Amino acid sequence: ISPIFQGGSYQLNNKSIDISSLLLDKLSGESQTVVMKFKADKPNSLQALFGLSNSKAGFKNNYFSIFMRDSGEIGVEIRDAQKGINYLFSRPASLWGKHKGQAVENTLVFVSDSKDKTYTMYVNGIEVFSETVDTFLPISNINGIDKATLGAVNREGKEHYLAKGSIDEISLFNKAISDQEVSTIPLSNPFQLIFQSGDSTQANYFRIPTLYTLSSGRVLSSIDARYGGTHDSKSKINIATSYSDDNGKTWSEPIFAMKFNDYEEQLVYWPRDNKLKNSQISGSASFIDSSIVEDKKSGKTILLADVMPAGIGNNNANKADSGFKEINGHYYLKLKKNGDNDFRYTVRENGVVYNETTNKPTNYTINDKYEVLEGGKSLTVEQYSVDFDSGSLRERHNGKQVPMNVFYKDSLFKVTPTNYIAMTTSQNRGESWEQFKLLPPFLGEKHNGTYLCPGQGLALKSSNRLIFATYTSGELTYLISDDSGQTWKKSSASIPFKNATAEAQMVELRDGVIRTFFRTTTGKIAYMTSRDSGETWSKVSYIDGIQQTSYGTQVSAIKYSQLIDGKEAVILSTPNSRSGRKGGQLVVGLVNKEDDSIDWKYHYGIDLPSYGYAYSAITELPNHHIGVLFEKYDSWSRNELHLSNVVQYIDLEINDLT
Template sequence: MRKILCIVLCVLLAVGVLVAGLGFVITPKSAKAPNDPVEGVKPFSASSELSCNYYRIPALWTTQSGTVLAAIDARYGGTHDSPNNIDAAVSRSFDAGQSWESPRLVAGFRDWANDGMLLKSNGSYTVADSASVIDPALLEDTTTGRIFLLMDAFPANAGAPASEVGTGYTQIDGQPALLLRKAGETEFSYTLREDGAIYDEAGAKTEYTVNARGEILENGQPLFLAQRRQKYWFNVPYVVETGEQVPMHIFYDGALFSALGTSYLYLLYSDDDGKTWSEPVELNAQVKPENVGFFGVSPGRGVQLTTGAHKGRLLFTAYALDAETGEQQFAALFSDDGGKTWQSGEFVTLTDEIRSMSETQLVECPDGSLLAFSRTTSGYMSVSRSTNGGESWSAPTLDDALPLSAGSGCQVSALRINRKLDGKDVVLLSAPAGEGRKNGFLYVGVLEADEAGTYGVDWKYKKELTDADTYFAYSCLTELPDGNIGLLYEQTNIAQSVDTVVFCSYTFSELCETPLD
């Protein structure tokens, strides 16, 4: 009997070791959601046609036509970051956020099936072998009406801490060429060039090409991979094939040619108010520094300058992570030709007091200068300034009027609205002030210039959005067509929480009821 028991234990151990190498951790198939869904309007819900239980990282924008556009991560593999099975979803509202159309996916990958399974809250439950997109930011060019959606993209097994140093490109005859590694080889000796063909290390064109979606073709015929699905035997996860063959992408595990395992930047656009979207354009060759591993989007919103020397400039922010030190610094990404080409500015300089400035949101001042509000690990938000359209930044300072959850901090949302208070332009900011991303506040301030003409914010009011015991994590603000303020936020910080991304709206007078102490 003892011998039989030992054999059974050895078999179970072997199965555990086997599945551990498949990119999974142990998760009960019938796990119960770790939360009760919160009340409120939900543009993205587990009950939608997307069959996704987990959503994170909201972005929000009101278009010139009055449509309220929301974007978010559809995290099929659980709420954790990349590497994971994550796609990008959008939804629209035509009545100032009271109701929303059915959400739809606009970017993502098909290497793993998008199954709506429930996972336990404890542990890091991800599909690590999946390619992913993550962290959306929205921006509209008011001249053309084109809406941009920027996000990170990762090959299988890559994420923020696990991003190899480099852009993933080399230069050939002055033009960027994507580096590729052929299956079974160790070096990235192949290149994808402007004509869409893959060239070998001798510079000879091969029979392989890559289309605009990143899919590999041989002699003009698409190559395929078997799509995979996560299943369970009791509490032990294992992998099966779905029976569907999906186009082979250079980001997929098992592809004939694969890209460098680092962070990439995907830019999509819509010319019909967010109804349909372009294929993604990859921006690393234009904006990512060669000596950086992770270089990712600050989720939320971008800005377009309306005055000054750089009027019309489009800006997002991105940040770099030093995986060894944990230090993070942001830089602006900007375009002066309507989003056709992009450049990156200088990184903000860290100080002894501020060793991390990651996810950052921008506000334009009346003179065209910029204020940057950044997530830090110092217990307060930081503020830095640019007088050259985001090309460089002043030394940052902490704003003691803007407490931020201690520890790793949290993303913030900042917005200048089309309203005056005491004759001055109004800025709004939302973020959690309490421990563990609880106790969310929305702050109201006015833009004021000092004697030297340098703008800052005088914070006047605050509104408590969630109490000290209620979560308030990532958020995004927008000014609604009716003049109210819209807010899309995560009312949780617990892994694998279901239906906790909520849309709310407030009148301006509601936000100005409590003066800032």
């Protein structure tokens, strides 16, 4: 249908605009839709974009508002004191501020639907909340409404929540438009989605982006497809991939690179309230933190990720057990059989399950996919699904049988409850992935796996050497392969932070010279250097001019192929803030050829200093543009858990940064 009201070019300069005479008498019926195209690149801390209120003395809490915060949160209030109703619905990290230094036009659609008793908000084509209530309050049924206002709420005759920004277009309709109709509204988005709610992964959440440009020109991306909200493991998480063959303009439907079947892939709206938000899928195996590299010799693409047995994550993994037994030089995966209190089995040659107590092979074998066979017949377990139908998280069998995997809760044979690293390869640049293989332990029998550094591995330019950074307590542990990923050895590099989440990414400054940038516990990004292709490492130094929080955030880094200001250049992607995971920047550093020092000369602001920016991936696209896939929210904040469609992709040119 047609709008009942439409206006535009409203400048909000800390002074409200009254549209009462234009709008109030046009409102009718119990359902309404507001469509608003607006900019706010310098918002106040809390500001109202649109208001309907009773402005009379004694009725200061009778109003409807659409508001935003300078954190990028968007929300509504719907309040009527006589009715005893005070609804507040919002979602953090819903907005853009600036892109390439210019204010972004956000397209907001708010639907107030009396039939379904639901309030739904979209921004930039993304649903950010959908809230159903028992007692519906139509936005124009607020007792004594006499003002319609842009850029404030008129309460008792005064301007509250004054806004700084502009409303380029606003339309209202006396209808709750359908989800279908919402999708036809034109957008002006500065970003794209590669992975998103409702795609082939069926995960409602994503975290931990990667990007890597392949020699064919294809750009590949991997990600955590996270099912049980945005929580780290323990959870259900798969690794998914997508690629672009047109310099990032379009992306393929995702496929899985690593997946478990013990729990269903369910798209779930995870609870965000303070009582339930820490609900966590607790009986599922998962993968977490992926990293990708391309091997020039074999032409293979190689992806590693951490692997977590059922119910396990970083916090409860057995730190004193690798999960392997060393028998005369080699490492064998240990297994515990149901009923036993110890691990009496190992997986030997050809997947044969061997009883360590009796030194006899058994009737069981472990296949390719870490599945259990008995006398060559596949065993199964019943799959679980999750729900909140009872008011709390329930994990229950769903009737479906899936192959019995040693990483599963219901398996007859179970691996040690600790963290592992697995690798998969693709021979068609991401169109399909091989079944994963566990990497051997690198730090001995009595040490849990190291933790993969998400992002990119490093392919040395003038050899066949491949390196993946990992971390553990007290060191970076570099995994090095010179045979296309068939065998690996470690190179340990001490760091002076005990139990740091030392997520590390590498650049090759020149032939054989690697600089690694990494997250610390000090508020500053650290670095170290190898001048022998990863064999040995320097002591740790710090980057000045970038601030992180005490807990830190993952940083991504590439060596740019083209000179900038006549110099070799490195580009770093990171939040730059002491107050949270926000203020994302790309920082361009120019290399001094005399000592390999780096002059960090340009800081490009991805969006406002107050808007969220957490883990990130950067790559030089084949056309020398820069692609960035990043978490556009504070993934540390306990207020911003479980947001959908916040991992976003942008395209930048080198001139945008400088």
